[PDB]
Design an enzyme around this catalytic site. Structure first.
Site, short mmCIF file in Angstrom:
data_model
loop_
_atom_site.label_atom_id
_atom_site.label_comp_id
_atom_site.label_asym_id
_atom_site.label_seq_id
_atom_site.Cartn_x
_atom_site.Cartn_y
_atom_site.Cartn_z
N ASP B 43 15.42 17.85 -11.88
CA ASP B 43 15.76 18.72 -13.00
C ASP B 43 16.88 18.10 -13.82
OD1 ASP B 43 15.48 21.16 -14.51
OD2 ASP B 43 14.94 22.15 -12.62
N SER B 93 14.27 24.63 -19.59
CA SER B 93 13.75 24.43 -18.24
C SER B 93 12.33 24.95 -18.10
CB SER B 93 14.67 25.11 -17.22
OG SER B 93 16.03 24.93 -17.55
N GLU B 274 18.83 31.19 0.94
CA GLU B 274 20.00 31.70 0.24
C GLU B 274 19.56 32.87 -0.63
OE1 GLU B 274 23.75 30.62 0.32
OE2 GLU B 274 22.50 30.59 2.13
N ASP B 289 22.03 25.81 6.92
CA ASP B 289 21.20 25.55 5.76
C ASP B 289 20.62 24.14 5.79
OD1 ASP B 289 20.97 27.51 3.26
OD2 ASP B 289 22.87 27.95 4.28
N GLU B 315 11.00 20.16 -6.15
CA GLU B 315 11.93 20.17 -7.27
C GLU B 315 13.33 19.90 -6.73
OE1 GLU B 315 13.65 23.46 -8.86
OE2 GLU B 315 13.55 22.87 -10.97
N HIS B 324 25.24 20.88 -16.05
CA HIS B 324 25.58 22.08 -16.80
C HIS B 324 27.03 22.49 -16.57
CE1 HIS B 324 22.12 23.22 -19.03
NE2 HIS B 324 21.32 23.34 -17.98
N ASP B 361 12.04 16.97 -16.37
CA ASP B 361 11.56 17.82 -17.45
C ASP B 361 12.25 17.53 -18.77
OD1 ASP B 361 13.83 18.57 -16.15
OD2 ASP B 361 13.38 20.72 -16.09
N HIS B 362 13.48 17.04 -18.73
CA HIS B 362 14.32 16.80 -19.89
C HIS B 362 15.55 16.06 -19.38
CE1 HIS B 362 16.97 19.91 -18.44
NE2 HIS B 362 15.99 20.79 -18.47
N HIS B 437 21.38 20.39 -22.70
CA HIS B 437 20.34 19.42 -22.42
C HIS B 437 20.39 18.28 -23.44
CE1 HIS B 437 17.72 22.63 -20.19
NE2 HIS B 437 18.79 22.27 -19.51
CA CA Z 1 21.61 30.01 4.36
MG MG Z 2 14.69 24.78 -12.59
ZN ZN Z 3 15.51 22.04 -16.59
ZN ZN Z 4 19.07 23.36 -17.51
#
Ligand code: CA
Ligand code: MG
Ligand code: ZN
Ligand code: ZN
Ligand SMILES: *[C@@H]1O[C@H](CO)[C@@H](O[C@@H]2O[C@H](CO)[C@@H](O)[C@H](O)[C@H]2NC(C)=O)[C@H](O)[C@H]1NC(C)=O
Ligand SMILES: *[C@@H]1O[C@H](CO)[C@@H](O[C@@H]2O[C@H](CO)[C@@H](O)[C@H](O)[C@H]2NC(C)=O)[C@H](O)[C@H]1NC(C)=O
Ligand SMILES: *[C@@H]1O[C@H](CO)[C@@H](O[C@@H]2O[C@H](CO)[C@@H](O)[C@H](O)[C@H]2NC(C)=O)[C@H](O)[C@H]1NC(C)=O
Ligand SMILES: *[C@@H]1O[C@H](CO)[C@@H](O[C@@H]2O[C@H](CO)[C@@H](O)[C@H](O)[C@H]2NC(C)=O)[C@H](O)[C@H]1NC(C)=O
Ligand SMILES: *[C@@H]1O[C@H](CO)[C@@H](O[C@@H]2O[C@H](CO)[C@@H](O)[C@H](O)[C@H]2NC(C)=O)[C@H](O)[C@H]1NC(C)=O
Ligand SMILES: *[C@@H]1O[C@H](CO)[C@@H](O[C@@H]2O[C@H](CO)[C@@H](O)[C@H](O)[C@H]2NC(C)=O)[C@H](O)[C@H]1NC(C)=O
Ligand SMILES: *[C@@H]1O[C@H](CO)[C@@H](O[C@@H]2O[C@H](CO)[C@@H](O)[C@H](O)[C@H]2NC(C)=O)[C@H](O)[C@H]1NC(C)=O
Ligand code: NAG
Ligand code: NAG
Ligand code: NAG
Ligand code: NAG
Ligand code: NAG
Ligand code: NAG
Ligand code: NAG
Ligand code: CA
Ligand code: CA
Ligand code: CA
Ligand code: MG
Ligand code: MG
Ligand code: ZN
Ligand code: ZN
Ligand code: ZN
Ligand code: ZN
Ligand code: ZN
Lengths: 484, 483, 484, 126
Positions: B43, B93, B274, B289, B315, B324, B361-362, B437
């Protein structure tokens, strides 16, 4: 060269804990059924040969070499193999082959039989035959293949299909009239007759297949390449006749034909590329001969069609011949070729369902030492001269073999010769026409389902009992039994 | 630094000729059939991110870094993807996820629908849905898997199964009352209802499955983890309900249960580890985890059974969230972790019958560079101070984002801070709550059958069409056609 | 915005399936011999630069932009090139040039030498020179050409002919005395003496060819345009003095000359149009100076004569200069001007016998984001204000460079200013006199014979090894050997 | 067009045919067809006593090639056979049609018994 990163304690600790982290995840054992079973046999690949070839592979990429990781080095589980025959302390190619391929230890020079058979005495063959994992695999419905760089009727491959009282009985031409009249048939003959549906057969030995004095397809003018069969049988034709007619059975003899085949359409392949053994990779013809990796790639692509799985026996067999000639650079370059082939096999199969095993049959009296500096060429010299005779010596040195050279009462000043030459024979302690095997143990490299079963010091005949148990073929089927 | 071996021209010529030998062998094209099909989605993993992540991976091994090979750097066939949404030059996204999962470029904020749909307006949805390669797989009898570190109802995974008009509609708690009256179903509800036999689902989004104000199993002391459904439904119970009672279905939620399992014994798996997004790899709990690599492994182990194969969508999310926040060390470490998963997935399958595709994706407005020397830490500084304000600057810089810091007309002297910290925000040109992005192209990595078909500069929607044509699934199956 | 036709899923499904159809016919690979080789070097044109330029080329046609197909977008095969120097994580114009033209990676600041050479030290040059593909072409009888918009002794074009330890030694005026005494020569001198029959030389740098203080042929009154050489040599005359007299050698300096000439009539062309670099395409004098595309066509028409083929290195040189200045509109128009020359070359040559590569030496810290609407002007604004300080921002933003502008406290409210200007400098994060390079990979574009040899992620120096293999030139001629 | 839809869903390396009259049925090589759609009438097929020998096959003729195709799979097969016009004959009160519809299914049960084995095939008639 002392690489800057290796001067930092954190580098070695970060690496060791990275190795430690991986070993902990390996506790989740691969216990699936080995659908496919591949065995790489490095003929003569002793422990010293593996480290020397590892340094060689890295130095071919302009690295020091010792930190280089072979494809077989990346195999998770390592074990040691006691390679002796019942007949002999320092074993031979044939008796060991029966051990790691049929699960029974035997006398030297005898493939496919037990120790009840005496060598060259064929009235002792009937009732003493032991079958191979390649036969167990075929009986279970799997495809089977044989890929080697020697004659396809050599000692190591012949144990997968033949039952013979002598490794020297290549065709009937090399048999004594006693054994022929007594009713015994050649390794070559047994290749086409014992298991008549072997899917892939690749290697050398074109001459042991054709009637005597038939000229070769490659070397028409060579008298030593002509056929040898005294019974007049075209064994290459016998091969095609035993397969059904709707099946695509081809037979090839050069590199152009192998790389032109579409594996998805060929059902039975027979590739014989040299009259006898095949050329060393350092001597190979890229136009007319395929490498060992090229033969392994196409073989796996054909054997992969079978839904039940496949067994493949790959032999980098000319490692052993290179050591016998005393030419380390040849034998070392043969090992790197098999390691490249090992990497190709790992690309075409998955560890989830393929158990791959890399080992040798025995070692050689090959050593390298002399306190050489980091990154020193494996074929290069020691950093100092002899305390005794004031002449230099190469890191590589043999126990015996043709390398023994004294220039009139005194051993040879090697600063005068090309010790880095492809054909250079490093010096030995005892002169012989051929360097001899070694009695020391060899390594076993295992990856895939149940690979963790090859774990400690083992009698050499233990190897095929693990691979058969993981594939649910042969005697013990308890791995596919329902409960547990 | 300069390694000694690189001062020798023969080294660079030997290296290029080995690469030239492998290029020639690649002429023998792989025209097999993709029995299995795996897509790795990084991503926001733009071209600048993959190079910095490659340098990071090697620097973890005390190598300079530039010479490192990523697992995806070893894929034979590379292409460029034009990422623009049909209504957005710099895409988002969701609308991109419709492109590389369904084959139709769409609008920003929409998943599983064509450009005829408008965002947040629901009476544009019916008659405008588009099906995905996950649906095309199950329709052809294969198994399907969804593995991610974001919520399972996040924009990118949701385009596999759902058809929503607004990516924000996670559960029905996050929907407008107008859209409920039109009779539209949120993404979380759609996970358990459109494809009722998704074999493997792993990721986050636990609280969008439990009834409202119901306490969460892992964090009972916290209420932002509480359930969100006004439905009062229980989609865990509902999940279990569309599977045949005689099949082995499990549902897990912590790491111990994941490794405890026998993949050879599970038919339908559901892991929600989560309440919302999963914790960054740099912040993850070893004990409770799992990592993305761990989840990919048992996912493939379960999906390998199907004799007709599987499709798996992994993903490597939270690469996007890292940029971000402007925290490049987190985004890069998320990218390295997805590369470990590409490696594990490469060993558990064979390139002979498994077509694997790795792409984004970008991109992001993430840059790095100050003529830094060889081996300079990717989170380090440039060698020179600014010739304008006599202050140091980091190699990594952002276009925009929260890394913008100014102590009253004075840009921050960075030698007074820990710029190599996990949460450090590299400086930026325009301050924002979140870094945006980037509209530039992304790379496409492919290996396996027909992987050579992703060859040049392609529209992003062309990606799943190739993966469809190779597995002989979907609207076209002429690859298996004896001509 | 949303164009009407793209609302239909049939439009994307049909468009994609036609791309699949073309990609399936691409399986039958062009394997002919590269009679001609053409390299296009967008200096500093990274992945984010080519997309912004793709939008610009389409917005100059009153279309949204993102759906435009650049002439290089139409190239079949894309690869990624790792650009770092031996010396530098973030590389320069000179060291990368040695990589993609000589096949060996080198230190920053040097051209045509291995990494054994240290920058600015002359006694480190002898023994470490590496030759370019422009020389391998000439040694094979092909014609060679260099077309650029920077100086002809700039870093990028000089890797094709020079060997220096410093890119900065344009003329002998610029070298230190120890460098002159130590034997080595300035780059401009090397352009006339190293390989003395380069067929076509075009670009700037005219002031480095004439003796010191010699008034320029264009700007008689401009001081800085006066010649620079302390040697005293007229390097335009030295160029003329080296050609065979039965051939036609023409020196030109303005656009009227260029289009006056008859290609099939001139054998050697040296065209130096500006004292320093050439003007940007946007600031270009329509009368006195030619466009890059106008130089590429005249260059090709002269180079097609030779029956053995030709090599031609073209450089979109002023893209790097545009990003260094923060002027995204200049860098983006330079890129679009180079792409027009790519399509110009595709009509004068045939992809049956001409291998064409378009790539870059490195990138810049140039970005564009902001969730801008479809069709938004590439030089325009983001739809929302900054949620932190309420003031707007442009789509195009830089990492560093002179776009930084805090007006005695706050950053500039750009609604008051001219953000679509030719010379507008978009805002940056760190203020510098010149914006720096990017360490990211750059894109490779390939069409023609064996263009498919550039397939994945490669080191930069791999590029000329491919071009030289397809053209059957240099060290490896295996493509023209009797094989397949 | 659900005949088209039936064809489209099948992978076309397999042999799918679709037929509608008796000549096409008795011409097939069962060893060479993997997917078969046989729709021989717009509504129900005619009673056996009213069958057209040239355009329409009997129940046994359909059952035989149906078994021959299903046997190619190594994992076995399941086959549902409906002599379902017995009911229509009884509903009309035409016992001569109902009983002849029954005899025809019994003839089919005999043919199925010859093409399979009691050792590995379970057959239920009800
Ligand atoms: Ca957990
Ligand atoms: Mg996503
Ligand atoms: Zn994205
Ligand atoms: Zn994003
Ligand atoms: C490799 O073997 C093939 C098959 O025998 C050779 O191809 C044949 O070449 C002869 C000429 O020597 C032709 O007359 C035949 O028609 C060819 N057969 C086919 C099927 O094409 C090939 O020449 C061999 N290559 C080498 C290098 O020995
Ligand atoms: C071994 O041979 C080498 C050379 O073949 C001998 O060393 C050289 O001898 C020549 C002749 O005197 C000198 O000019 C060289 O300087 C010597 N050294 C080298 C490195 O070439 C060496 O003496 C011989 N050693 C023995 C024990 O015979
Ligand atoms: C992981 O989840 C399992 C399942 O809930 C936990 O095991 C439970 O432990 C509690 C008390 O320790 C028992 O009452 C449950 O019966 C257990 N369930 C099962 C299925 O065994 C386990 O403790 C969790 N581990 C962590 C680290 O959170
Ligand atoms: C940025 O901050 C550093 C300190 O964090 C400044 O450099 C130090 O300045 C003090 C006193 O001026 C000296 O004692 C130190 O030796 C300096 N060096 C270091 C490494 O701390 C630096 O001047 C500041 N930059 C600006 C532009 O103010
Ligand atoms: C381009 O350069 C040429 C050559 O210097 C110029 O042409 C010559 O100009 C002189 C005097 O200016 C005349 O006596 C010649 O007759 C011209 N020759 C030709 C062939 O025209 C020309 O003026 C320059 N053009 C521009 C636009 O500057
Ligand atoms: C940034 O500058 C613009 C233009 O100077 C400002 O926009 C104008 O603001 C005044 C009142 O402040 C309004 O009367 C005008 O109508 C606005 N212009 C337009 C085109 O609408 C803007 O307010 C400034 N913003 C900041 C934060 O300084
Ligand atoms: C049974 O069906 C076949 C297939 O449709 C019919 O054969 C066709 O007959 C027509 C006209 O007689 C020809 O135009 C076609 O070319 C034939 N097709 C084939 C594949 O043979 C056959 O006539 C039908 N028979 C009955 C009795 O209805
Ligand atoms: C086999 O025959 C050889 C000679 O032909 C003889 O020496 C040997 O004793 C025989 N062995 C047996 C077991 O018959
Ligand atoms: C094999 O290929 C290499 C490639 O450079 C060449 O040097 C060598 O001569 C070739 N040998 C043969 C026997 O074809
Ligand atoms: C539904 O779509 C129609 C389009 O004709 C629109 O007029 C209407 O307003 C929409 N529904 C609502 C509740 O607005
Ligand atoms: C995870 O394991 C590493 C291994 O050393 C350890 O350093 C770290 O503290 C552990 N963290 C957690 C949250 O368990
Ligand atoms: C290079 O030149 C300098 C200048 O005198 C000298 O000091 C140095 O020793 C020389 N080194 C080499 C390797 O030539
Ligand atoms: C190029 O010619 C056109 C048409 O006469 C003119 O409008 C333009 O100004 C010229 N170029 C420049 C840079 O002025
Ligand atoms: C075919 O139909 C005719 C007409 O009813 C009948 O005479 C005949 O017995 C039937 N069966 C055949 C010809 O096998
Ligand atoms: Ca041969
Ligand atoms: Ca001019
Ligand atoms: Ca009918
Ligand atoms: Mg042997
Ligand atoms: Mg340049
Ligand atoms: Zn041996
Ligand atoms: Zn031996
Ligand atoms: Zn540059
Ligand atoms: Zn530059
Ligand atoms: Zn009824």
């Amino acid at each position: 060269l002392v690489p800057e990163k290796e001067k930092d304690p954190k580098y070695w600790r970060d690496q060791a804990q990275e190795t430690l982290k991986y070993a902990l995840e390996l506790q989740k054992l691969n216990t699936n059924v080995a659908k496919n079973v591949i065995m790489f046999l490095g003929d003569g690949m002793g422990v010293s040969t593996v480290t020397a070839a590892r340094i060689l592979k890295g130095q071919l990429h302009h690295n020091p070499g010792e930190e280089t990781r072979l494809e077989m080095d990346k195999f998770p589980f390592v074990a040691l193999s006691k390679t002796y025959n019942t007949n002999a302390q320092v074993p031979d190619s044939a008796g060991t082959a029966t051990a790691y391929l049929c699960g029974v230890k035997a006398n030297e020079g005898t493939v496919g039989v037990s120790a009840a058979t005496e060598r060259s005495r064929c009235n002792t063959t009937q009732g003493n035959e032991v079958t191979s994992i390649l036969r167990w695999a075929k009986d279970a419905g799997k495809s089977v293949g044989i890929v080697t760089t020697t004659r396809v009727n050599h000692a190591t491959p012949s144990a997968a299909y033949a039952h013979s009282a002598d490794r020297d009985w290549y065709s009937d031409n090399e048999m004594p009239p006693e054994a022929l009249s007594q009713g015994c048939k050649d390794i070559a003959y047994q290749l086409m007759h014992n298991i008549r549906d072997i899917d892939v057969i690749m290697g050398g030995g074109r001459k042991y297949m054709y009637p005597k004095n038939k000229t070769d397809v490659e070397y028409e003018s060579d008298e030593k390449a002509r056929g040898t069969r005294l019974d007049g049988l075209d064994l290459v034709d016998t091969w095609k006749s035993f397969k059904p007619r709707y099946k695509h059975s081809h037979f090839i003899w050069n590199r152009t034909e192998l790389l032109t085949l579409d594996p998805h359409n060929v059902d039975y392949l027979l590739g014989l590329f040299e009259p006898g053994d095949m050329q060393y990779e350092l001597n190979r013809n890229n136009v007319t001969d395929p490498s060992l990796s090229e033969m392994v790639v196409v073989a796996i692509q054909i054997l992969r069609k079978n839904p039940k799985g496949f067994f493949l026996l790959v032999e980098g067999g000319r490692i052993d011949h290179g050591h016998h000639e005393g030419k380390a650079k040849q034998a070392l370059h043969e090992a790197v070729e098999m390691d490249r082939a090992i990497g190709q096999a790992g690309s075409l199969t998955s560890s989830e369902d393929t158990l791959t095993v890399v080992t040798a049959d025995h070692s050689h009296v090959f050593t390298f030492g002399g306190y050489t500096p980091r990154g020193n060429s494996i074929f290069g010299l020691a950093p100092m001269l002899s305390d005794t005779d004031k002449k230099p010596f190469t890191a590589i040195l043999y126990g015996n073999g043709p390398g023994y050279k004294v220039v009139g009462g005194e051993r040879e000043n090697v600063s005068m010769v090309d010790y880095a030459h492809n054909n250079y024979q490093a010096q030995s302690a005892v002169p012989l026409r051929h360097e001899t095997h070694g009695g020391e143990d060899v390594a076993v490299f295992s990856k895939g389902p149940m690979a963790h079963l090859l774990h400690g010091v083992h009698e050499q005949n233990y190897v095929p009992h693990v691979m058969a148990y993981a594939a649910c073929i042969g005697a013990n089927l308890g791995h596919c039994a329902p409960a547990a």
